[PDB]
Amino acid sequence: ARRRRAEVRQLQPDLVYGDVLVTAFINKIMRDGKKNLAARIFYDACKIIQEKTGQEPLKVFKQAVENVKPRMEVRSRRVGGANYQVPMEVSPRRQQSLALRWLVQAANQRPERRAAVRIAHELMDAAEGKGGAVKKKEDVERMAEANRAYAHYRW
Amino acid sequence: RKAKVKATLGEFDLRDYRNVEVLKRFLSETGKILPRRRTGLSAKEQRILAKTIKRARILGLLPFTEKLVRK
Amino acid sequence: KRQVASGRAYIHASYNNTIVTITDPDGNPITWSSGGVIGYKGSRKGTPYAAQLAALDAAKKAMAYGMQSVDVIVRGTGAGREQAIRALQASGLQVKSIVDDTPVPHNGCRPKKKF
RNA sequence: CGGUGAAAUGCGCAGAUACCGGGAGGAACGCCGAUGGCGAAGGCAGCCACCUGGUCCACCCGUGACGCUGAGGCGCGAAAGCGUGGGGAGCAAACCGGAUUAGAUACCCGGGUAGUCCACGCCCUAAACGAUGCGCGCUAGGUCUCUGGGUCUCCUGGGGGCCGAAGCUAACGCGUUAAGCGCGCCGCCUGGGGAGUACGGCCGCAAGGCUGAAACUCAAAGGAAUUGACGGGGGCCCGCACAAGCGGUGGA
Ligand SMILES: [Mg+2]
Ligand SMILES: [Mg+2]
Ligand SMILES: [Mg+2]
Ligand SMILES: [Mg+2]
Ligand SMILES: [Mg+2]
Ligand SMILES: [Mg+2]
Ligand SMILES: [Mg+2]
Ligand SMILES: [Mg+2]
Ligand SMILES: [Mg+2]
Ligand SMILES: [Mg+2]
Ligand SMILES: [Mg+2]
Ligand SMILES: [Mg+2]
Ligand SMILES: [Mg+2]
Ligand SMILES: [Mg+2]
Ligand SMILES: [Mg+2]
Ligand SMILES: [Mg+2]
Ligand SMILES: [Mg+2]
Ligand SMILES: [Mg+2]
Ligand SMILES: [Mg+2]
Ligand SMILES: [Mg+2]
Ligand SMILES: [Mg+2]
Ligand SMILES: [Mg+2]
Ligand SMILES: [Mg+2]
Ligand SMILES: [Mg+2]
Ligand SMILES: [Mg+2]
Ligand SMILES: [Mg+2]
Ligand SMILES: [Mg+2]
Ligand SMILES: [Mg+2]
Ligand SMILES: [Mg+2]
Ligand SMILES: [Mg+2]
Ligand SMILES: [Mg+2]
Ligand SMILES: [Mg+2]
Ligand SMILES: [Mg+2]
Ligand SMILES: [Mg+2]
Ligand SMILES: [Mg+2]
Ligand SMILES: [Mg+2]
Ligand SMILES: [Mg+2]
């Protein structure tokens, strides 16, 4: 983006709950344009969630994002010697986006044999405060105030 | 034009190296002799003042240097 | 051992390192701290964070000697001179005054090649 | 603690750094301070008093051409450097040690002797530059500034700058602070390299200085300006160029 600021894509609302966040997540699950399979892996994972907790999966979902959303991170700057690892606060969107990505990426790590489950579980675990979804949030946030000695080379 | 010390004063003797109450006003928060910009003084005046303050400091009446108090 | 009501916090910041000693109202030092004492090695001592540390520990050791209030004297241009202050300011010591007393020669010793 | 891009050498539990008080010592004078002033130049800034040079303005009082220039001579002459004596804080050639680097044998860091400081005597060179000899007359103005005088809106002298008439210039530029228009007098130049070398002479305690070639060799050496290209120069802008992503190649 060198001339203009790039204008965020407006997503279509979800076909079951209406929350655009649902869809954003879905897309991140799918691969190779296989949107149907994705939705199925999402919505079936809701069923397991609606099953093993009783409450509403939409909200366990909308909760498991706050608990992976990193309040700030480290970016990179090079000054006059080499590259001091600089801290810097993370925007509205970049948080939401980092979250969905991380949820999926580490959901896919879990030992569970089937996809829908793997999503369901990570989407549950993290919704509480455990599981390598948060531990990769509690990681990027760790280095945020572990290199705060270099927090004056800001932009 | 923050405030010119030529105006806030009547007439005085620039060669008077004892008139602390006057001289005092041509120094900064530090002992530093104000710039002609803030003194409003003539070209000739400032050189005269300059010597008078030096004379008076040496006499013990005006300070060589101060210390800046964060006010 | 002693009990010191009010006192002085001297802050001497280099480009290389920031030292903070705390003294009695007669100026005799009680406890001090620096960036290296915090436990930093080289380049890292001269840092607005290292300095925020040096100050905090300085007042930590201090309020254990009963310290309550302090007048502050900073000598020097340098990083986190300002941080050292604010660190003191919001440390739990009431900050009576701040002054700068950085020694400016009235034109004396020829300085080293790199000035 | 210090120190650098990072770091070590160094210093520190014989208590350093940081802090307060006492003392000694040397060297340089912050602010005023200017894009300012003075000087023939080199150069000259804390303050005071003494001794002393140049210089500007007013008055238009005295002399009555007494003027200008100036081979040689004589004196001044930054810094480094020489001799004797004193001094030595900080700094710092050489030298010692740490790093860097392909190698440093330099640039960076920690030390450190001469020296830098005073007196006396030498040295006498410089990008000693305005790279512009001195003196005088003449040739629009504008503006800023230091400094005199007036019937001090403004007028009138002497400096210092910027911009410009005429003119000058190869151009850049100069332009009443001339590089313009003229007169006087001095110094100097006559292709590049060889070469500020050789020889000789003079000065010098020395280091060395002043004066100064040719043989030879080249066909250029040069000045300013133009277009371009390039810059580990600056400014603004663009490309999936980097970044932010998604998916791969490199492995089988
Ligand atoms: Mg733009
Ligand atoms: Mg002392
Ligand atoms: Mg001594
Ligand atoms: Mg002159
Ligand atoms: Mg000069
Ligand atoms: Mg007459
Ligand atoms: Mg006669
Ligand atoms: Mg007569
Ligand atoms: Mg004469
Ligand atoms: Mg003559
Ligand atoms: Mg000499
Ligand atoms: Mg000398
Ligand atoms: Mg000598
Ligand atoms: Mg000697
Ligand atoms: Mg070496
Ligand atoms: Mg050295
Ligand atoms: Mg040294
Ligand atoms: Mg006249
Ligand atoms: Mg005038
Ligand atoms: Mg003039
Ligand atoms: Mg001109
Ligand atoms: Mg013309
Ligand atoms: Mg003339
Ligand atoms: Mg000519
Ligand atoms: Mg010839
Ligand atoms: Mg020839
Ligand atoms: Mg010669
Ligand atoms: Mg020579
Ligand atoms: Mg010569
Ligand atoms: Mg000879
Ligand atoms: Mg001899
Ligand atoms: Mg000569
Ligand atoms: Mg040329
Ligand atoms: Mg460029
Ligand atoms: Mg990329
Ligand atoms: Mg890849
Ligand atoms: Mg292959």
Curated annotation (Swiss-Prot), chain A:
Keywords: Ribonucleoprotein, Ribosomal protein, RNA-binding, rRNA-binding, tRNA-binding. GO terms for biological process: translation. InterPro entries: Ribosomal_uS7, Ribosomal_uS7_bac/org-type, Ribosomal_uS7_CS, Ribosomal_uS7_dom, Ribosomal_uS7_dom_sf. GO terms for molecular function: rRNA binding; structural constituent of ribosome; tRNA binding. GO terms for cellular component: small ribosomal subunit. Belongs to the universal ribosomal protein uS7 family. One of the primary rRNA binding proteins, it binds directly to 3'-end of the 16S rRNA where it nucleates assembly of the head domain of the 30S subunit. Is located at the subunit interface close to the decoding center. Binds mRNA and the E site tRNA blocking its exit path in the ribosome. This blockage implies that this section of the ribosome must be able to move to release the deacetylated tRNA. Part of the 30S ribosomal subunit. Contacts proteins S9 and S11. Binds to the C-terminus of IF3 and to the C-terminus of Era. PANTHER family: RIBOSOMAL PROTEIN S7. HAMAP family: Ribosomal_uS7_B. This is Small ribosomal subunit protein uS7. The gene is rpsG.
Swiss-Prot record, chain B:
It comes from the Bacteria. The keyword Nucleotide-binding does not apply. The keyword Transmembrane does not apply. GO terms for cellular component: ribonucleoprotein complex; ribosome. One of its GO terms (biological process) is translation. One of its GO terms (molecular function) is structural constituent of ribosome. Keywords: Ribonucleoprotein, Ribosomal protein, RNA-binding, rRNA-binding. Located on the back of the platform of the 30S subunit where it stabilizes the close packing of several RNA helices of the 16S rRNA. Forms part of the Shine-Dalgarno cleft in the 70S ribosome, where it probably interacts with the Shine-Dalgarno helix. Part of the 30S ribosomal subunit. Forms a tight heterodimer with protein bS6, also interacts with protein uS11. Binds to the C-terminus of IF3 and to the central section of Era. Belongs to the bacterial ribosomal protein bS18 family. This is Small ribosomal subunit protein bS18. The lineage of its organism: Bacteria, Thermotogati, Deinococcota, Deinococci, Thermales. The gene is rpsR.
From Swiss-Prot, chain C:
It comes from Thermus thermophilus (strain ATCC 27634 / DSM 579 / HB8). One of its GO terms (biological process) is translation. InterPro entries: Ribosomal_uS11, Ribosomal_uS11_bac-type, Ribosomal_uS11_CS, Ribosomal_uS11_sf. Residues 109-115 have a biased composition (Basic residues). Residues 99-115 are annotated as: Disordered. Keywords: Ribonucleoprotein, Ribosomal protein, RNA-binding, rRNA-binding. One of its GO terms (molecular function) is structural constituent of ribosome. The lineage of its organism: Bacteria, Thermotogati, Deinococcota, Deinococci, Thermales. This is Small ribosomal subunit protein uS11. Pfam families: Ribosomal_S11. One of its GO terms (cellular component) is ribonucleoprotein complex. Belongs to the universal ribosomal protein uS11 family. Part of the 30S ribosomal subunit. Interacts with proteins S7 and S18. Binds to the C-terminus of IF-3; however exactly how IF-3 interacts with the 30S subunit is unclear. May contact the C-terminus of Era. Located on the upper part of the platform of the 30S subunit, where it bridges several disparate RNA helices of the 16S rRNA. Forms part of the Shine-Dalgarno cleft in the 70S ribosome, where it interacts both with the Shine-Dalgarno helix and mRNA. It comes from the Bacteria.
